[PDB]
Amino acid sequence: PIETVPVKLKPGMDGPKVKQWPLTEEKIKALVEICTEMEKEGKISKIGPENPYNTPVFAIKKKDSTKWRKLVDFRELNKRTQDFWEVQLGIPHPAGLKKKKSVTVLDVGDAYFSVPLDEDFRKYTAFTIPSINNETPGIRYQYNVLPQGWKGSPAIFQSSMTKILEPFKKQNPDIVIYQYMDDLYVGSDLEIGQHRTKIEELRQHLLRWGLTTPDKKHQKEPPFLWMGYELHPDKWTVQPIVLPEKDSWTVNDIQKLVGKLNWASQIYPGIKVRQLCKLLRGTKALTEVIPLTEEAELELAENREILKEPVHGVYYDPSKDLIAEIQKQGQGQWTYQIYQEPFKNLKTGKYARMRGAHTNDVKQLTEAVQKITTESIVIWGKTPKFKLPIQKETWETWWTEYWQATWIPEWEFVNTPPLVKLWYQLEKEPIVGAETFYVDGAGYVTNKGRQNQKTELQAIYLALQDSGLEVNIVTDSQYALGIIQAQPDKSESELVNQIIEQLIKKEKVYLAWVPAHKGI
Amino acid sequence: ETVPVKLKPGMDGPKVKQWPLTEEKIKALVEICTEMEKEGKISKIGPENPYNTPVFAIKKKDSTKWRKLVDFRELNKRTQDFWEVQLGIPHPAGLKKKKSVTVLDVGDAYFSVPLDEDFRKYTAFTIPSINNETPGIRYQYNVLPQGWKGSPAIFQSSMTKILEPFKKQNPDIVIYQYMDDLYVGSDLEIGQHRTKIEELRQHLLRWGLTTPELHPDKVQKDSWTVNDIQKLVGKLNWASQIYPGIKVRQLCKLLRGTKALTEVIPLTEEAELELAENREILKGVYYDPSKDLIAEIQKQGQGQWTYQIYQEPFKNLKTGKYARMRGAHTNDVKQLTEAVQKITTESIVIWGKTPKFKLPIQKETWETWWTEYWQATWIPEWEFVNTPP
Ligand SMILES: N#Cc1ccc2c(Oc3ccccc3OCCn3ccc(=S)[nH]c3=O)cccc2c1
């Protein structure tokens, strides 16, 4: 017998009350048959007319087996119920699973009909099975056991299973039991001979506490197909991914394609989806057809080529240290690889650039490092030792000049194309013997005598070409001044592209701000 | 006897989510919490309690033993407005003028006093699991929480009874209790202050009060190039808002027009006198008793961090500068963390409140790296969002 959890309605809300619309004769015959069987087993107990609460029943014949089953809509009952700690919604990532000699999948059977329910709350879960016409008011039933579809069934069953499994985990500490939904995943380092005995002992424990489990013969054998992951004995791979070859492409098709490619990126290295997501920028009808641009077609060709090869990941041995490599890609794509030993990869991924944002490659690298750090914390619990393209001196220059606070875990320098380094290379002091420049948002006034926010950007660009290699400029606008300051090597905007192209060649360019002043 | 604790009218308890933590922190929290439950301070809760409050493990005074900080800010926003109005804590003003002020942690006392049965449920915390292996072990605080404002309010009667003999013996000592901290301030010399603090520690320990040093006495040749005068007039326009007597119109006339950036310009006489008058002008501290103090941290680089505490903008109540102090470790996260702690302690000794912080760092970086370098029980309300300085 399992102790019940105290559950109550939300403060100030009465029990559900809904009326049951009439149903056909075949449906009521099936419903009374199944309900009488359940009452004989004991899940539902008939209650008299004292209870005024009703929750309607809808009879459905599932296409398989041609049998009429019962589905009760508890939506109203779910609304009129105390809040419960949401069950964890993140599936265990296969990368963090430490390899064990034998692993079994024990799927508990009819669990929500085995964990019981609180006596006070049994009253509101009353459903009516109508009689033919109005000869009798009908049959009235209540639920002694946890209903299906109720808000709190997952949390209550999870707590019940945890309490039942706790003493077994205390007695046998080597066995590791993962819980996800109803199933219990059990893994022990023991040989198969003792492991079968231990799994039988777990089954008998759950049977003495009332939870049925599958038999020894019916337990699944490797490989396992779980939430899109194929878990082999010594490798984890995503399920076979078939990219659609449809010539026509709808917004829904592109959404599915991007979702599939993002799911594939976790093991497949080099999957690029940036162009497709740019195709999906704006809202459109799912029937609306967006033609594949040339850039997106190139992206889909390279992605399909990558998906042709099979790639497999490896599980986690805690002794060795995690190592993360970030490899630069075109534009703002950043492919990151996590591997404990070389050429065997635990997980691959991508960091897409901030949509509609132009930033320095070093700042994008910093964001990528932070994303890797948080993902590694969540999955494994330790931050990796990074291996980054950027040179230490470039990082130090940007770190000291930048106004925010940026830190990166222990990292080292890997030599590979491309290498991230600063391009603007601005200085902070005026140059003697160099032309001194004034800009006003496209006119230029000069010591030599030579004579809206984007306009200042245009004006500050015009300053560079005229002056030459060594320049000293002052700008009337802090916006253009900040654009040149930010050292944006992304070159997303066209005007900024022009400015960077002209700036890279120059040997020494220093720019300062002069406020507008009363008088000449 | 349990005292009635009530949330503010029409406010729901905390539901905040928990931040994933490292395996070492999870193991330390698990062992600490298991021992604490065996002692009786925390007890298990099932799924019927939805409320949650984060748990962070910090290492104190670079010692081996881990400690636990429960970020009870969301619960404090609701409960303290009930308890502080109902019970309150007076603030001594002499702590500013005291030559020496010391902080003694007092958290062990709250581990003895019980708590209201109904209010227990709103103090719930979870210890996360790596890779979603198991649902987190959830707990509730049966005994008075450590780090939740209102625990000093509930324990104030006992604290007064426990400090009355010592305060009667020593009239000059000034003692003020923010949450889990006692501020002892003496005008005596520093050695005598050490002796008095030792005497206070012995007194508290003998009365069953277990406990484990900022100095308040100690606000901040060649004619210049044309662009240098431009830099000065830029600072003029910047500081026009801060002080009204500041004036620009005479240094401006020197740089008016197009000039060479390396040109050497002698000052006009009126411009030089105007520079002197501006300096004289440079050379609204009215603290609103009820306001949200906000402190802005500005990274000047080179291991220097300037802060400004102000209630309404352009009326600074205090300005200062903090310099880097560790040559072995240079990370901006740690430097910002120590800046925040020092600013908060100075604010606590000067006025009652702990400021809201506008931090320069970015959101995820702070969220990932604050717990490693935090060394204080209190947790201020920070906005990771920064403004470009
Ligand atoms: N379908 C299904 C399914 C089956 C097992 C799962 C699982 O098993 C473990 C359970 C406990 C510890 C380690 C585990 O896995 C180690 C790694 N591992 C994985 C597979 C094999 S065959 N052998 C092996 O060593 C953990 C999480 C999800 C699971 C889903």
Curated annotation (Swiss-Prot), chain A:
- What does the UniProt entry say about where the protein is found? Virion
Species annotation: Human immunodeficiency virus type 1 group M subtype B (isolate BH10) (HIV-1)
Task: Give the misc comment.
Answer: Error-prone enzyme that lacks a proof-reading function. High mutations rate is a direct consequence of this characteristic. RT also displays frequent template switching leading to high recombination rate. Recombination mostly occurs between homologous regions of the two copackaged RNA genomes. If these two RNA molecules derive from different viral strains, reverse transcription will give rise to highly recombinated proviral DNAs.
- Spell out the residues of the site Essential for RT p66/p51 heterodimerization: W398, W411
In UniProt terms, what is the effect of altering Y402L? No effect on RT p66/p51 heterodimerization
Q: What would changing Y479 to A/G/H/L/S/Q do, according to UniProt?
A: Complete loss of RNAase H activity
- Tell me what happens on changing V186I: 25% increase of DNA-directed DNA polymerase activity. No loss of RNA-directed DNA polymerase activity
Please describe the quaternary structure of this protein: Heterodimer of p66 RT and p51 RT (RT p66/p51). Heterodimerization of RT is essential for DNA polymerase activity. The overall folding of the subdomains is similar in p66 RT and p51 RT but the spatial arrangements of the subdomains are dramatically different.
The observed outcome of changing M227A is:
No effect on RNA-dependent DNA polymerase activity. No effect on RNA 5'-end and 3'-end cleavages
Q: What is the effect of changing A296L?
A: 68% loss of polymerase activity. 10% loss of RNase H activity
Q: Where is this region: RT 'primer grip'?
A: 224-232
State the name under which the record lists this protein.
Reverse transcriptase/ribonuclease H
Q: What effect is documented for mutating W263T? A: Complete loss of polymerase activity. 87% loss of RNase H activity
User: Can you tell me which residues bind Mg(2+) 2?
Assistant: D440, E456, D476
| Outcome of swapping K62E | Strong decrease in RT binding affinity for all dNTP substrates and in catalytic efficiency. 100-fold decreased sensitivity to ddNTP inhibitors
Present the record's domain note: RT is structured in five subdomains: finger, palm, thumb, connection and RNase H. Within the palm subdomain, the 'primer grip' region is thought to be involved in the positioning of the primer terminus for accommodating the incoming nucleotide. The RNase H domain stabilizes the association of RT with primer-template. The tryptophan repeat motif is involved in RT p66/p51 dimerization.
The outcome of changing M181L is: 90% loss of polymerase activity. No loss of RNase H activity
Q: What does this protein do?
A: Multifunctional enzyme that converts the viral RNA genome into dsDNA in the cytoplasm, shortly after virus entry into the cell. This enzyme displays a DNA polymerase activity that can copy either DNA or RNA templates, and a ribonuclease H (RNase H) activity that cleaves the RNA strand of RNA-DNA heteroduplexes in a partially processive 3' to 5' endonucleasic mode. Conversion of viral genomic RNA into dsDNA requires many steps. A tRNA(3)-Lys binds to the primer-binding site (PBS) situated at the 5'-end of the viral RNA.
